[PDB]
């Protein structure tokens, strides 16, 4: 990589790894359509396996970006509309608090206080129904944003219903495969286990536990290479050949709501570029916030800092790109460490490259 890129990356990441005691980490910088990869430490401390460009990391919430794009693609195909009421896709949701809650609200965490986590006792399809039927909103829809897996996760499951495909088959077929993300998985197959890094929490090796709506909200695993390719696809969607996928990517970066200096897309979150670092950096763990509707939603704005933070019990990831500068970055680590530290590192790096 150009010495410049090499230096800013190493001088920023090296101290990060040491301060946060991160076991392993991979970073990709995408500059003008070219990726440069970097790796440090261990994917598996016990068996001394190093992190490589083929190491699979749990993306955690960064998976919501794939979900937002797949949903965006379903919209482009004419299969669903964000203005459709949720009950159109789950008519069994007859409890009246659901009247007025649209797929847009589910996708952008504005349904009225859907919880951060689906409860652990929710197993079966009927258990999920019961959870949503019994949930009591704190707010009318479209008034406040409360980050929630139970919200976009539900969006993801309904989004793929007209297609006939399961969420995983839709994702592989309409998103992963077309984008040639061949080492990106919702379920890691036995053949790829040798590359599946262990996450580390309190010194113990851990992998994400199965859970209701996990695939839709936080269950994707991927390599720094596929993730860099994911970033390039989002940086330049107009270069994607699949018509609906190209529109889907654009739809996921549309600004639907505003809170403070942040705009909510489908999965992706955005701020106007240039951004104040303390605006995105300090902008840390998930609170209840009033939202102003953007009527109609603003189409993807090239001068934006588009990003998504993500974590599982043992992994910490972050993705950010500036379309206008054809610049992006991916940081994958097998330790959930403070969000502000990820954003600060990403900012030092990207700001240095323009």
From Swiss-Prot:
E.C. code: 3.5.2.6
Coiled coil: none
Compartment(s) of residence: Periplasm
Residues at the catalytic site: 61 (acyl-ester intermediate)
Domain of life per record: Bacteria
GO BP terms: antibiotic catabolic process; response to antibiotic
Any GO molecular function: beta-lactamase activity
Keyword Signal among record annotations: yes
PANTHER family: BETA-LACTAMASE-RELATED, D-ALANYL-D-ALANINE-CARBOXYPEPTIDASE/ENDOPEPTIDASE AMPH
Name recorded for this polypeptide: Beta-lactamase
Organism of origin: Escherichia coli (strain K12)
């Amino acid at each position: 990589a150009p010495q410049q890129i090499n230096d800013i990356v190493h001088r920023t990441i090296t101290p990060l790894i040491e301060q946060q005691k991160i076991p392993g980490m991979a970073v990709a910088v995408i500059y003008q359509g070219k990726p440069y990869y970097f790796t440090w430490g261990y994917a598996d401390i016990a068996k001394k396996q190093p992190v490589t460009q083929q190491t699979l990391f749990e993306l955690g919430s960064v998976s919501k970006t794939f979900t937002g794009v797949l949903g965006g693609d379903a919209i482009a195909r004419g299969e669903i509309k964000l203005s459709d009421p949720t009950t159109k896709y789950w008519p069994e949701l007859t409890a009246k608090q659901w009247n007025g809650i649209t797929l847009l609200h589910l996708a952008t965490y504005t349904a009225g206080g859907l919880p951060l986590q689906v409860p652990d006792e929710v197993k079966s399809s009927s258990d999920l129904l019961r959870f949503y039927q019994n949930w009591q909103p704190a707010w009318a829809p479209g008034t406040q944003r409360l980050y929630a897996n139970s919200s976009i996760g539900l969006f993801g499951a309904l989004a793929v219903k007209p297609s006939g495909l399961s969420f995983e088959q839709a994702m592989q077929t309409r998103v992963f495969q077309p984008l040639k993300l061949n080492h990106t998985w919702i379920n890691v197959p036995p053949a790829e286990e040798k590359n599946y890094a262990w996450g580390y929490r309190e010194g113990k090796a851990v992998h994400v536990s199965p859970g209701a709506l996990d695939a839709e909200a936080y269950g994707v695993k991927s390599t720094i290479e596929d993730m860099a390719r994911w970033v390039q696809s989002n940086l330049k969607p107009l270069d994607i050949n699949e018509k609906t996928l190209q529109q889907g990517i654009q739809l996921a970066q549309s600004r639907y709501w505003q809170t403070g200096d942040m705009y909510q897309g489908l999965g992706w979150e955005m701020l106007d570029w240039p951004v104040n670092p303390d605006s995105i950096i300090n902008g840390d763990n998930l609170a209840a916030r009033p939202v102003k509707a953007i009527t109609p939603p603003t189409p993807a704005v090239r001068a934006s800092w588009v990003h998504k933070t993500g974590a599982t019990g043992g992994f910490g990831s972050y993705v950010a790109f500036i379309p206008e500068k054809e610049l992006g970055i991916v940081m994958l680590a097998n330790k959930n460490y403070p969000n502000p530290a990820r954003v600060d590192a990403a900012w030092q790096i990207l700001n240095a490259l323009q």
